[PDB]
Amino acid sequence: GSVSCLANALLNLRSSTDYNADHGVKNSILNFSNSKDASRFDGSESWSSSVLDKNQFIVAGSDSVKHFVAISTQGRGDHDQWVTSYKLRYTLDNVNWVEYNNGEIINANKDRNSIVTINFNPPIKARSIAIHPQTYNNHISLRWELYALPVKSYSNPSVQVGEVSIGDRSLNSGTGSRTIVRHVKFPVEFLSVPIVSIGCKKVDAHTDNGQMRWEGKSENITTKGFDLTFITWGNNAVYDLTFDYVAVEFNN
């Protein structure tokens, strides 16, 4: 499953013109249908432009970088109007706009209800995308859907950073496996339990017959903090060790 962006209300829509508000982009979702009552008008089953020319469009946008894998278009559900061809333009940085496939005119609908779907390989990578109807039956009227790849579990992570040292002579003597634990509080509590990555930025340690032995481990990670377990073994004397840590929260 890809994501149906309009169905999920993921994108802002902006048309060039509307026939009136009862023909607005709010009425443009694929398969949109309203009351079948012939005595009261509740709006077109489509966006319909006001101006009929080759310069009309709907822009769809949001802040996220989307990978668009398809677009589907359909005509108007309640009257004989539909877009028969269009062009597509898009932008990643919202400053520089590009023409899809050098301004290819894409062949579109030929009736009220049949769905015509264009697939993108590779995906169009964009923050905003615009459909530009070029030809039409009766009126520039359409329904549509944009399909994007779902967001990855690893996207938009939250991050907190710090440093942690032994800070005393706890590991500076003795024999065999020896550890000390420093408890670290994150500056702010996370909403779920992060992972904690660590890297050494100071070693002050004595070899044991030429062998250096030191290790750091992040352990007992909660939303509030974690334990840096400093570890030596054999007969090494560790005077101090310092780690920077990067705590990363996913999915929140």
Place this chain on the structure above:
Amino acid sequence: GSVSCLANALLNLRSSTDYNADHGVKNSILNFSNSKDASRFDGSESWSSSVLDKNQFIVAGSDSVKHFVAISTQGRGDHDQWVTSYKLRYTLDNVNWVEYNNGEIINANKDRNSIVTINFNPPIKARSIAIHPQTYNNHISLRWELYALPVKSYSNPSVQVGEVSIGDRSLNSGTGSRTIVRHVKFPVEFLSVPIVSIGCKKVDAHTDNGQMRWEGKSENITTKGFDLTFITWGNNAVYDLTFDYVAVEFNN
């Protein structure tokens, strides 16, 4: 304070049907009220559906993962219509939708103006959420607000990475505290001053009577770069040291 999402214009809204555009979701914010003039209609003080059945809804969405802590609903301000019960559905990945509390029918409004608030513990974690009115007085008409936790200071950070080495024999001789500074330019200038985290990925150093002594510090961090101060002391000779750095910008 939680965030009033509609008040702050944080979510796109999409209804199943509207009575017409003058009854659209744009009119649905909690406590919405317009001109009290009886001679001109400026729109309902509510969203109102067009179709009256058990299949109508408003979807609210955006790209961010929200933690919804409450929903409030209210009836229509200018006419005797209000939703008396509803269901809620939501989605995190915008592909898979779930029914809140196994499709619990929530008891809602009984007049025009009184606010009925449902609290979520734990918070509903979602990109999009849909209210599905089930029963109503007169018409499916509502006002509403969604309340989410505020965004954390640590969310959506910007990141730049690199590596930095001594690259010569500056630290390879001498006695006592000795340092050298390498200035590092970020590939692109940040908008505010980042933190810089560092971890060692190369040691080429001589012990001093068995003691190893090396340290790296990021210092003098600006929007443009920072100084990696490489440090040794006692009588160690450091031939080379290499750090990877992770520069993180928050709040921008």
Place this chain on the structure above:
Amino acid sequence: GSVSCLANALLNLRSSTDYNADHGVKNSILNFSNSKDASRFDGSESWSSSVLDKNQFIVAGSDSVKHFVAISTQGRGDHDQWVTSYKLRYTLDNVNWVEYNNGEIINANKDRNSIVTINFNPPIKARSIAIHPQTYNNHISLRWELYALPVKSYSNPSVQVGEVSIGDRSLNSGTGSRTIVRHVKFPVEFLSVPIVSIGCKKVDAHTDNGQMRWEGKSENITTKGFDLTFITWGNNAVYDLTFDYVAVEFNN
């Protein structure tokens, strides 16, 4: 170029009141114009309020932190109405709202079509921003655009983390440049090739006549994983080494 936020459909808009849906915020973009046909009304070339008082507004919002560098306003294109002064309020956390320049009344339009632009130095840093018309000619009617800095290449990166060790005695003997490669699969495949940053969190190694020599390198990075090349040289015997890695994907 800064970003034209409304042109690019980047922000949700919410007005206090609309004269009706045919005067809604959907009609408010700078230079908006529709059919010049005098016989059919397709909507005002502006947002127009319904209530005329000092309490009307449009809020523009989305989840991203924007750096607003300018606002432009214009009157109504199709009738003699325009906003002659306004105030601005904004919010970063969507809980706490601030008044721009202590509630400065900004002098605005004096006709239908001329654009009046206010520049912000420093940029207003905000998730949502509201224009509050204070005085007007004929009606509270406006067109507008908000201009923000473009998003940086380094924003909203995706991140994956892990750890990698030699895990055997491959580097524990021998002379001269010696390496072993551990291949690392990311828990999930990236959409483009990430950078991989590394930091050491365990050293178990023997000096060679007092010299310590160890290095780690991330190499052959693909969307699926990378190689950690563990390196020693001279005559050092490395028993084990462990790195945490941070893989960062940009622009996706």
